[PDB]
Amino acid sequence: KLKRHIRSHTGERPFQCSLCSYASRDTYKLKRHMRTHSGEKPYECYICHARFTQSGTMKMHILQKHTENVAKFHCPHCDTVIARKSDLGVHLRKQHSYIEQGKKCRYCDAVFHERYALIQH
DNA sequence: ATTCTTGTTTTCATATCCTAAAATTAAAGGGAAAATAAACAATACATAACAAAACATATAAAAACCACCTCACTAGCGCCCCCTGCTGGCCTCTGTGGGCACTGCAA
Ligand SMILES: [Zn+2]
Ligand SMILES: [Zn+2]
Ligand SMILES: [Zn+2]
Ligand SMILES: [Zn+2]
Incomplete structure (x- = not known):
């Protein structure tokens, strides 16, 4: 485990994909x-029979599609609710990240440093 | 008639032999002190026999040493999710762009 761990610092990827450029840290x-190259798919969502490449994708599919009463995530800055955490990630990166050079309002001279305040104005 | 050699008994003579008294001298006999020898008895040394102590061999008696087996630890590499975060389309809801019909005002 520690041998495998050290590649997280160094960056060694001693496992090459013979069919593309990808290279992984472990087996x-x-x-x-x-x-993804062979097209083999061993796992199957038992409810809808939809097809997926990856087990974790199937688990998230079950959680978002065939599950009830699941907790959501509320944005701290704005008042909208959205389902997936990773989409809350992309929401904070595209709308509430700090924009260095700023953005000006389309109709007035006011400049803003976050896209949210701009759209709100 | 007178003178001269030669042979044979007589008688002193001078060495020898015999005779006996001295002396004497060595033998020989006895008294006695050494004295070597010898017979016997004692001591010390050497040899042989018996009994015991010391040395060497066998054996087995614990006992020590070495090697193998075995039951674990130590590495080793996948194996298998699993969770978490970024990424790349996707789609639909606001929102960006525009054509155009419509109206209020004042000729
Ligand atoms: Zn590949
Ligand atoms: Zn499903
Ligand atoms: Zn927000
Ligand atoms: Zn403005």
């Missing part, structure tokens, strides 16, 4: 990459 990530 499992390479075996998981192989399904």
